[PDB]
Structure formats: structure tokens, C-alpha cells
Design a protein around this ligand. Structure first.
Ligand SMILES: *[C@@H]1O[C@H](CO)[C@@H](O)[C@H](O)[C@H]1NC(C)=O
Ligand SMILES: *[C@@H]1O[C@H](CO)[C@@H](O)[C@H](O)[C@H]1NC(C)=O
Ligand SMILES: *[C@@H]1O[C@H](CO)[C@@H](O)[C@H](O)[C@H]1NC(C)=O
Lengths: 57, 50
């Protein structure tokens, strides 16, 4: 939504552009648009949905 | 200077005009072909008239 996706070599994170602050990639950090096939240079990773542990209570 | 992939730099420059990033990545070949064509018109205009 704001910032950029970045990898430390094995994990994937999202960070603001002008200062490195790695956050776990989640549905409130990101927005969906369309299927995987269109974007050149896309990568596979988990996106954490923060509601699921709440429903699992 | 900080390196960044040019397709992601254009996604930031789209995001700077109120157009969402995915509008570029879903159209990246079109945007590249429109730019390459437009630079061709600059060459031909400058060759055509002083
Ligand atoms: C990358 O981040 C994870 C976060 O848990 C860490 O375990 C790992 O050591 C970091 N470095 C590399 C090279 O993966
Ligand atoms: C980056 O370019 C290399 C060739 O220089 C290519 O093998 C690779 O698949 C490309 N990766 C992406 C993410 O476009
Ligand atoms: C991404 O993950 C899907 C499902 O596992 C798989 O079909 C696809 O080939 C993967 N792409 C890459 C580049 O690994």
C-alpha cells in the first residue's frame, strides 16, 4: 500500500522507502489486484491474514 | 545513488500522480512500447525539421 517488498536473503518483508524498517507481510500492509500471471518478476511468498489467529481462539 | 529496478521506479512515479502501482505492472509492456514509440517520434521530428 505504501513502501516496497524486500528480502534479507531468505525471508520477505515490506518496508517504507526512505528508511529500512522490515514488517511481516500482511493483508493490511498490501492490496490485491488480479492473478499471478500478468506481473513481470513477481515472486511466491506467504501473506499473513491477521484475522485468522483471532478466529482460531 | 540507490539502485532500484526501472519497472519499480516507474511504479513509484505512477504512484506519485495518484495512479495505483498495479496500473503499471498490469500494463508494463504497453507502457514500455508507448515510451519506445514516443522516443522514436522525437528522433523523427528532430531529423525532419530544424
Ligand atoms: C532473515 O530474517 C530472519 C527473520 O527470522 C532471520 O531468521 C534470518 O537469520 C535473516 N537472515 C538471513 C540471511 O536469512
Ligand atoms: C533478470 O534478468 C536476468 C537476465 O539478465 C533474467 O535471467 C532474470 O530471469 C530476470 N529476473 C527478473 C525478476 O526479471
Ligand atoms: C509459484 O507457486 C505456484 C504454486 O506452488 C507454482 O505453480 C509456480 O510455478 C511457482 N512459481 C515459481 C517461479 O516458483
Amino acid at each position: 500500500r505504501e513502501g516496497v517488498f524486500v528480502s534479507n536473503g531468505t525471508h520477505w518483508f515490506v518496508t517504507q522507502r526512505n528508511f529500512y524498517e522490515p514488517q511481516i507481510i500482511t493483508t493490511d500492509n498490501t492490496f490485491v489486484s488480479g492473478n499471478c500471471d500478468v506481473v513481470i518478476g513477481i515472486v511466491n511468498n506467504t501473506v499473513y491474514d491477521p484475522l485468522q489467529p483471532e478466529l482460531d481462539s | 545513488a540507490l539502485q532500484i529496478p526501472f519497472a519499480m521506479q516507474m511504479a513509484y512515479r505512477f504512484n506519485g500522480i495518484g495512479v495505483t502501482q498495479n496500473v503499471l505492472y498490469e500494463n508494463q509492456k504497453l507502457i514500455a512500447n508507448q515510451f519506445n514509440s514516443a522516443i522514436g517520434k522525437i528522433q523523427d521530428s528532430l531529423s525532419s525539421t530544424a
